[PDB]
Each structure stands twice: as structure tokens, then as C-alpha cells.
């Protein structure tokens, strides 16, 4: 089961609502929402080892992880966090995050590969769930 590829977005819901729960300044939220409408997502997968680059004109993130092993990244609001990804099923990985400092809403994410050429990202903050769907470019 192979997440590798260059992905572009087709659907998004609750991205703005997610940033709102995390308390992102309303002006920065409006910029992020604009940027997030047109991302380029590059995934390189070798077994359980992943590289994910999410590029927009405003902000680019790169994460490196191995399913089952602790790593560090940022929350979607830009706060350093400790992360752990596990397989929920053959096609779906789930990630729990803990802030390195401070408190804030409980955040997590999932990535799922469908049988019809889609990649589904969810990102959660307390009980706001953002769902983003991508297809290969
Ligand atoms: C205004 C500024 C610089 C700073 C505030 C935050 C919220 C950190 C920010 N976030 C984004 C984004 C995004 C994004 C795109 C795509 C995806 C995806 O996975 O498709 C996720 C997040 C942009 N700009 C900002």
C-alpha cells in the first residue's frame, strides 16, 4: 500500500474552523485559508518510512517519520510537538501529538489511501475535525 506521489487538493472542510479552535489570529487565519486552497503535497514512502512535504506559496512544512517511532514536527498552528504515528489499518495511519511546551487543544491527524486514487487527511483539535481530500498530480 503506497502513499508515494505528488498530490493536489480537491475538497476541504473545517480548515478555518480548526485554526479558530487553535486561536490563530483572524488575519493569519484568512491568509492560511487562502494559501491552503492550492497546496502541493509530496510524499516519499519506503516501507514504514515517510517524507511528507506540504508546500504553499506562503508556508512549506517537511516531516520525516517512521510508523511506530516517536518524532517531532509542528502542530497545524506552528507549535513544536512530539508525534507518534501508528497503522490503524492497512490503508490508514493515525498520529497523536503532544505540545513540547504550553498547553492547547488536543491535536492529531490521520492519512488514508483509498481504492479510487484519493488521499484523505484529517486534522483534529479537540472536537473540530478538518477533512482534506487529494488526488495525484
Ligand atoms: C499565515 C501563516 C503564515 C501563519 C499561521 C499558520 C496557521 C501557521 C499558517 N498556516 C498556513 C498553512 C497551511 C496548510 C496548507 C496545506 C495543508 C495541507 O496539509 O494540505 C495544511 C496546512 C499558511 N500560512 C500560515
Author numbering: 2 to 138
Q: What do the paper's sentences say?
A:
The cellular retinoic acid-binding proteins CRABPI and CRABPII act as gatekeepers and facilitators for the passage of all-trans-retinoic acid (and related derivatives) through the cytoplasm to access retinoic acid receptors (RARs) in the nucleus. In this article, crystal structures are presented of the L29C mutant of Homo sapiens CRABPI in complex with naturally occurring fatty acids (1.64 Å resolution) and with the synthetic retinoid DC645 (2.41 Å resolution), and of CRABPII in complex with the ligands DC479 (1.80 Å resolution) and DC645 (1.71 Å resolution). The retinoic acid-binding ability of both CRABPI and CRABPII is centred on a hydrophobic pocket created by an orthogonal β-sheet fold and capped with a pair of antiparallel α-helices formed from residues 15–35 partway into the sequence. The pocket contains, at its most buried end, a trio of residues (Arg112, Arg132 and Tyr134 in CRABPI; Arg112, Arg133 and Tyr135 in CRABPII) that are responsible for binding to the carboxylic acid moiety of ATRA, usually in concert with a water molecule that is conserved in all structures with similarly binding ligands.
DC645 was developed as part of a library of synthetic retinoids following the EC23 archetype but lacking the fluorescence-enhancing elements used in earlier series (including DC479). Instead, a tetrahydroquinoxaline derivative offers enhanced hydrogen-bonding opportunities in the mid-section, creating interactions with solvent and Arg60 at the mouth of the binding site, which is likely to help to stabilize the protein–ligand complex. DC645 was chosen for co-crystallization owing to the increasing evidence of its positive effect on neurite outgrowth in cellular models of Alzheimer’s disease. The incorporation of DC645 into the CRABPII binding site, fully engaged with the binding triad, is an important step in understanding its interaction with the retinoid signalling pathway and indicates that the molecule will be transported to the nucleus. The ligand-binding residues and the carboxylic acid motif of the ligand are very closely aligned, with a slight deviation of the tetrahydroquinoxaline tail groups between the CRABPI-L29C and CRABPII structures. The structures presented above may also offer some insight into why CRABPII binds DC645 with greater efficacy than CRABPI-L29C. It can be seen in the ligand-binding site that residue Arg60, which is positioned to create a hydrogen-bonding network between the ligand and several water molecules in CRABPII, does not have the same orientation relative to the ligand in CRABPI-L29C.
